[PDB]
Write a protein that binds this DNA or RNA. Structure first.
Ligand SMILES: Nc1nc2c(ncn2[C@@H]2O[C@H](COP(=O)(O)OP(=O)(O)CP(=O)(O)O)[C@@H](O)[C@H]2O)c(=O)[nH]1
Lengths: 466, 79
RNA sequence: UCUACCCAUGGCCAGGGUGAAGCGCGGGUAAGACCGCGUGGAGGCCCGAACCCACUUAGGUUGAAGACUGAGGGGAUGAGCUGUGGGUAGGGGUGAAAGGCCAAUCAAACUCCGUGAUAGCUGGUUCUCCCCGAAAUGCAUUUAGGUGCAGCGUCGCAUGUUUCUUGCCGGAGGUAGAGCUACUGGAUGGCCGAUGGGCCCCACAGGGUUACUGACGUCAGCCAAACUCCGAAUGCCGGU
RNA sequence: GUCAGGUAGAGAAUACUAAGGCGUACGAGUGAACUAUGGUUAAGGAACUCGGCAAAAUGCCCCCGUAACUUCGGGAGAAG
RNA sequence: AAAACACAGGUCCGUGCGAAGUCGCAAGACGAUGUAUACGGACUGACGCCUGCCCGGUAGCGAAAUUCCUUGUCGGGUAAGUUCCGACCUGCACGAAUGGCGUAACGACUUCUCAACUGUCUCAACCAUAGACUCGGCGAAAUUGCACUACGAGUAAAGAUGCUCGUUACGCGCGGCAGGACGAAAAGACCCCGGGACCUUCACUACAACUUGGUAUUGGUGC
RNA sequence: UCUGAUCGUAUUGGGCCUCUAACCUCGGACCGUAUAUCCGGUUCAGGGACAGUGCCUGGUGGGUAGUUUAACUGGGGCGGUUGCCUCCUAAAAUGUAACGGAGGCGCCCAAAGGUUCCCUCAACCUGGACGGCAAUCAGGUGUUGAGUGUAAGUGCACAAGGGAGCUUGACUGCGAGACGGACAUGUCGAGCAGGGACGAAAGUCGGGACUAGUGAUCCGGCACCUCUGAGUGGAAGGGGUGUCGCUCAACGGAUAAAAGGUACCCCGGGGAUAACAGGCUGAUCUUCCCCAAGAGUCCAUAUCGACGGGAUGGUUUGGCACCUCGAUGUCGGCUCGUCGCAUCCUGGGGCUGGAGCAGGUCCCAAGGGUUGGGCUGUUCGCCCAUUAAAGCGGCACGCG
RNA sequence: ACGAGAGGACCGGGACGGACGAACCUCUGGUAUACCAGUUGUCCCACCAGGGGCACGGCUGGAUAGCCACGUUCGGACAG
């Protein structure tokens, strides 16, 4: 093969564009700091950053995302080497001799989890399993494992189980049997689809008949839960109350932003995919216009297509929506990538549901914990994005003002001189309505309130002309 | 999917063969045992495999010496 | 004498169609390949009877018939179909090959004989009453639905009872129960008080400082089948 | 295996007939269902069904006229 | 009845002649009254295509006709369109330097779309004939432990005419239907066990089919 | 006849090359013979001491043949196992099964066997440069701990554990009695020869702390014997004693010698045993509650409901293997039904999370009805056009 | 009713339906094996004319009755 199909140019192919070692970012630093119960995790991880269809920063950020996923699911991540190639291998996933090199790397580390970011096909999964003798990290399976461990409600659990079964069905042969054998209780392998403890002993049922039956059952159930959620949201839909959806990337506040803009106490954890069910709550604009602020599930760069049902609630909230508060954090590697991923999912939803793109109020948080390297055009490159940093109370008033300005009012401004013999007709104006510039004269007042539509028809009583 | 077990040795039919009060002949096996659960008492020998046998004719008796159970043979009065 | 193939010698293939080279040329043309008009009548050529076959369908399916009938269907000058007379014979023949056919039977035809083959497998085994009366267990087994031995049923010996039941007496157990600070694996508390991280006094001497990871130990509390400091009841072995 | 009338017909097909030979060996009846074999069928027209299975349809002679492709022979009785 | 066999063409191997190869113990025979342009055997199965720097080097080529294609995307075809047809597709591929692609004609081959046609169907109706049915004559059959042989819910060797408790039911026919009698038929072909047979083979052991010694057979010299 | 070369006569068994006479030729001619591609004879020609066919002998040898190709098994296959030892199961004697729970094996030791004698730390301090979780060490008690050829019951400072001497209990060769356990296996008192230790002191101590560390018989060896010796003056040709040879590991060992395929199959049987259906069960499946955490814009219960819990039903996949293997016909479609309600219209309650309305979610009350097509083996589904709706199931997944 | 709209009723009262079923044959339409007519081939009735047998009732165009559906009429109810 000295000159056969000149791909094997220099021994290991792609002299420097192949597996190399420069220590990279080395991912997170998670080591033994609390000496207690070694029965914790799945050993150390090594970064192998593929630049395919991207740059070094993009690959590093993506693999850091994968390592954060792994650390949330368990495992440990404290090393970085390099590996690059502009051809996702059909047979393997890391390369011709890169597979054996990765086997040597995992043997030297003493671990069964390093990196295999990106959704794989069954061919790639089983070939890499044969090559290295142990699974390492599959991105889709790892996201599904995080969702399985974080599933709380029956709806979330059923959605995650259906997603895992949809992912398992095509790849039930090699990877399927391997993870059926696996009893260590790790990402995917006995990961379960429930939550704490979970059904690891059976996992995704690793059996064609059982998987298909369970998928059909969960599909019927998810139809039922879609109907149930339709009934639950009917009250809001019929009230026509302004609905504001907090969309954005995983982490990046969002849940914190909800708990700040309101008095809520929704789960706010530093781990990824802490919120699996969208949650709605009261909100009061500065002008008094009530609205519904809803925290949603967090998106990632390439959301697995199996989580369609898991994210259907969030997508429906986006479809209804009236402001789309887009929450991002400036304390990440190039938050514009986060912005772009969330924007692409939003645009996909808009195209699917054939609706006008609702406003998108861009908000950045964690600014207090940001490095401040950018003066006004790098840290605030966006022209009109809001900066809040929920933790230390600041900028939230500006966020509320932008919310109120962007959300178009359905009320109508009126000048009604309600007599003092009515009483109720002015008390209700105060109650359902936004009074301002009310005259103190006991004779015919002139209340310049922004009354809702039904009250706007009771003007001819004492409307006057000006 | 199978079981790694399934083996077992033959039961060695150990234990006491002549209990207290039984009249035995010299050389009669009194206890088949592993080790000295019972120790050779009076007119009782200990075999290579820890088999306690009567050294003299008489009746089997079980005693305790220094906190150790012993098998003795009490001579039987001639009729 | 069926059928497969072959050999010899005969026979049959209604009707209709299409139109394979040499003559003369308009020619092509120096000349040739070759176009066309006539002639000629080739072809495992076409349509289609007899004939041979057997694709579809319906019927038949104790049939009219142990393979057929009706309606369609294929070949129908050919590697055609056929009559007569022959040849090849069984582990052999023949096979455009399907284990197809070789007399309604073929992964080795049929008849007779060996022969009343053998079968740990099914089945059957025919009159009566009197006495007694099981087993479905153990060991072994090319053994597991078989068999050998033992166990358990059926006359004469010894026996007066050695059997068995009850009482009492002597006996070894480690089960049931618990108990675990009695061992091997666990459980809420504070404790002189382990690394002590941490404030540090500011010693790198040396020392309190421990919000928190919490040593041994200790405090009532709890479990075990392969735990036992204990430990029955029964059962068993003897004697009476 | 031989002979092979007539009229239509290309014909030894087919229909009807001459000569000749037969009515062939259970019959008589009876508008049951149902089965079989034929026949017809409004309006649809493959919606039947595994499948146009079966049926239905085209069908002959003479004039015309005949495609893709082709091994230049064909396709071809194209089709119309 | 086919896509299988055969086939014309091809390639390889064997055979120098009572050849090889076959039938035979042998003689002998076919091969063939043939003689490497011929016979036998093997495998393909008309016909056409399938060489890239050097086929002096990495070395079998990287094009194309290559459809596993699951290829998704998109369409064409249906209102819903399978077979299938196209571009985009799919990366070291991948499967064919001779086994893969084409290929007119042909096909009771498999699959599909059309036009026409229709009782295939919506959805069936009517007519005739042969049965069926009635009368006369002749006159079987498989099957059969029985019998003045119900239904329900139970029970039972776990699916009952025969048992239980009830419910129903006058006796006997005739023409029909086919739900049961675990209906008849064939001592289940499936599965297992025991045996057999035949087939395969680098299972065992043999035997048929070839070399060595000396018999037949053996003289000297140049040695 | 040696310390014993050296040449010569015949014989001699091979190898090269040769001519002819055996033998061979389906090469010619002639003859028997009128007939004759037979056959035989004669002759020539050619192989021509060249090749050949018997006997012997290695080798290749599915070309042919006879056969083998284990069993257990919650059917069979696949996988695993097969003998021995230890433990638990095992229900306090013994014994006790399962494809029950755990392990070991099947060796090793000439000084880890015998005897005689003797011992002595498991963890704190002071410490002990180095040398802390450790030294060579010293004390105390830890009270019999502790640890100790290889898993249970034992053995301890009465040492089966740890050291030392002997010189070879390395106790071997002849062994009443008793016994424990089908054969097989296992225990030892004791008597005799010879020794080993301890000796003064006694006269005392039969491989290993003990249970695994193995393989019957046959057939063969190999050493010794006061046996036999196919008429024997006699010997050579077999036995006895002790020892050897089997992963005969399928370990009671069918052969010294053996793998498969069968849907081309056949026969003898089996519902002793699988596939269908039935039956039991109900893990799975299906349909159903709560102290309700939480979601539902305000709020557990309009709608839902996690973590847990409890059942129904017998429509799934199973588990079992109880009827049926001297036959209980399968999926789908057609035809014809019949039944249940677990509701796709008709009546209500709540939500009115419709404040309201058109609508709709949820939970309580079978008479009828519940379409036609395309793609589907299609049990499933998806799609097209409708519909008031295009229900879910049982009936041998009703009905050949 | 809402009383902002968008949209838009319950309950009652009429008209016309779809599917299913029953009866019936006036209509429509199907069938029609002793009806009528046309017509091909053939053979007969001696011949012409006119008819008949056979060829699916030879074929074709109609076709009363009966039987039918695609046709007609009626039904599901109203009340207790
Ligand atoms: N310093 C800082 N930390 C913040 C800020 N906003 C959020 N965080 C932290 O980041 C973490 C992100 O978790 P969360 O707020 O739930 O983000 P999220 O988007 O809901 C995670 P998911 O989307 O998967 O549910 C929180 O633990 C929070 O403490 C901020 O403005 N500043």
């Amino acid at each position: 093969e000295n000159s056969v199909a000149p791909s094997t140019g220099e021994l290991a192919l792609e002299d420097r564009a192949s597996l190399r070692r420069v220590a990279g970012l080395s991912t997170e630093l998670a080591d033994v700091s609390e000496v207690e119960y070694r029965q914790l995790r799945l050993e150390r991880v090594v970064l192998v950053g593929v630049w395919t269809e991207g740059s070094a920063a993009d690959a590093e950020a993506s693999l850091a995302e994968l390592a954060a996923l792994a650390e949330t699911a368990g495992s440990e991540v404290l090393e970085g080497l390099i590996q690059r190639r502009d051809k996702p291998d059909p047979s393997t996933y890391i390369g011709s001799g890169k597979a054996a090199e990765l086997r040597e790397v995992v043997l030297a580390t003493g671990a069964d989890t390093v990196i295999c970011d990106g959704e794989l096909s069954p061919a790639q999964l089983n070939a890499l399993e044969k090559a290295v003798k142990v699974k390492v990290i599959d991105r889709t399976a790892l996201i599904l494992d995080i969702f399985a461990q974080h599933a709380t409600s029956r709806e979330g659990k059923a959605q995650v189980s259906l997603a895992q079964m949809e992912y398992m069905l095509p790849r039930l042969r090699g990877w399927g049997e391997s993870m059926s054998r696996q009893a260590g209780g790790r990402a995917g392998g006995a990961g379960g689809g429930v939550g704490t403890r979970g059904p690891g002993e059976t996992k995704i049922e690793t059996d064609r008949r059982r998987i298909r039956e369970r998928m059909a059952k969960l599909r019927r159930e998810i139809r039922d839960m879609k109907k149930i959620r339709d009934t639950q949201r009917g009250s809001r839909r019929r009230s026509e109350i302004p609905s504001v959806a907090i969309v954005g990337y995983t982490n990046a506040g969002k849940s914190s932003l909800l708990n700040a803009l309101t008095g809520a106490g929704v789960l706010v954890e530093n781990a990824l995919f802490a919120t699996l069910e969208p949650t709605t709550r009261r909100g009061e604009f500065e002008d008094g216009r009530p609205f519904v602020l809803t925290d949603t599930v967090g998106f990632v760069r390439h959301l697995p297509t199996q989580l369609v049902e898991a994210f259907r609630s969030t997508l429906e909230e986006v479809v209804d929506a009236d402001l789309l508060i887009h929450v991002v954090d400036g304390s990440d590697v190039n938050p514009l990538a986060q912005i772009n991923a969330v924007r692409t999912v939003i645009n996909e939803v808009v195209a699917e549901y054939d609706i006008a793109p609702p406003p998108e109020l861009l908000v950045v948080n964690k600014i207090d914990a940001a490095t401040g390297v950018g003066l006004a055009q790098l840290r605030r490159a966006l022209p009109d994005a809001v900066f809040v940093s929920a933790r230390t109370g600041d900028g939230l008033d500006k966020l509320r003002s932008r919310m109120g300005e962007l959300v178009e009012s359905t009320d109508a401004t009126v000048d009604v001189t309600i007599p003092y013999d009515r009483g109720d007709l002015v008390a209700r104006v105060h109650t359902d309505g936004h009074v301002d510039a009310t005259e103190h004269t006991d004779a015919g007042t002139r209340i310049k309130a922004r009354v809702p539509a039904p009250l706007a028809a009771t003007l001819r009583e004492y409307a006057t002309f000006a | 999917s199978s079981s790694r077990n399934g083996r077992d040795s033959a039961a060695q039919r150990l234990g006491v063969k002549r209990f207290g009060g039984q009249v035995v002949k010299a050389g009669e096996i009194l206890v088949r045992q592993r080790g000295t659960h019972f120790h050779p008492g009076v007119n009782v020998g200990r075999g290579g495999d820890d088999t306690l046998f009567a050294l003299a004719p008489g009746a089997v008796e079980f005693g305790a010496k220094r906190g150790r159970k012993t098998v003795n043979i009490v001579p039987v009065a001639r009729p």
